[PDB]
Enzyme design. Structure first.
Site, PDB file in Angstrom:
ATOM      1  CB  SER A 142      10.162 -12.915  -1.313  1.00 43.93           C
ATOM      2  OG  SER A 142      11.379 -13.489  -0.875  1.00 43.93           O
TER       3      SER A 142
ATOM      4  CG  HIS B 290       3.818  -4.022   4.055  1.00 44.09           C
ATOM      5  ND1 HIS B 290       5.175  -4.007   4.281  1.00 44.09           N
ATOM      6  CD2 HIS B 290       3.366  -5.198   4.546  1.00 44.09           C
ATOM      7  CE1 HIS B 290       5.530  -5.131   4.877  1.00 44.09           C
ATOM      8  NE2 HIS B 290       4.451  -5.870   5.050  1.00 44.09           N
TER       9      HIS B 290
ATOM     10  CE  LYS C  55       6.892 -12.666   2.032  1.00 46.90           C
ATOM     11  NZ  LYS C  55       7.281 -13.621   3.105  1.00 46.90           N
TER      12      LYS C  55
END
Length: 223
Positions: free
Chosen positions: A114, A84, A41
């Site tokens: 988020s 990520h 995110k």
């Protein structure tokens, strides 16, 4: 079925990502590759979408869609790779061949909020529970991909000795233009929402915890 977190090298991840992390040490990075890396995110899909247009498939480095194609090795240079994965779990070949990386750091509080909502929608992630329960894990780095603090700080230090374009999510929102320029000049080509969620108690506990973990780290997220 909301499975527990599996640790790989001390870093927590969801079961599916851990498995795919096994055949990762068989990847060979080309000198002209490009990696887009951000904590969950934090703008991976945003930056990847932009760089995808400049070059004209941006595959996830740690994903494996069962029943479907690995495919990057079979891809024509220059390759675009997104992930990520923290520096601790990043394929060594990427650091060896000094590949260019576009990293994006986002406000801790916005990422937590988020990531929380994402945990609720994504039923393969562990049960996030209440916002207070989750915020506690986020601060303890007990979430998929580990500590935001480490993820964000390590890539900051690495950027001092490696070709990494350290960007900030806020700057991409407030001024997309100048940021796309930085990205272009890097690759060498040419062309407070959390406030309604964080309680004052949670915010003070976060700021105090943040003040100490970030002690001795030039990172600054002006507001």
């Amino acid at each position: 079925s909301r499975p527990p977190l599996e640790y790989v090298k001390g870093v927590p991840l969801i079961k599916y990502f851990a498995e795919a992390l096994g055949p990762l040490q068989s990847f060979q990075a080309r000198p002209d590759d490009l990696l887009i890396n951000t904590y969950p995110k934090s703008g991976t899909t945003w930056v990847s979408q932009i760089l995808d247009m400049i070059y004209q498939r941006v595959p996830f480095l740690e994903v494996n869609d069962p029943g479907e194609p690995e495919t990057l090795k079979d891809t024509p240079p220059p390759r675009l790779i997104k992930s990520h994965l923290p520096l601790a779990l990043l394929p060594q070949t990427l650091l060896d061949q000094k590949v260019k990386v576009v990293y994006v750091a986002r406000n801790p509080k916005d990422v937590a909020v988020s990531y929380y909502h994402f945990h609720r929608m994504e039923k393969a992630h562990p049960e996030p529970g209440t916002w207070d329960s989750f915020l506690e894990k986020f601060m303890a780095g007990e979430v998929s991909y580990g500590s935001w603090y480490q993820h964000v700080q390590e890539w900051w230090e690495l950027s001092r000795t490696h070709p990494v374009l350290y960007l900030f999510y806020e700057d991409m929102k407030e001024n997309p233009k100048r940021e796309i320029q930085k990205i272009l000049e890097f690759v060498g080509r040419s062309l407070g929402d959390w406030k309604t969620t964080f309680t004052v108690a949670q915010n003070e506990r976060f700021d105090a915890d943040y003040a100490e973990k970030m002690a001795g780290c030039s990172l600054s997220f002006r507001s």
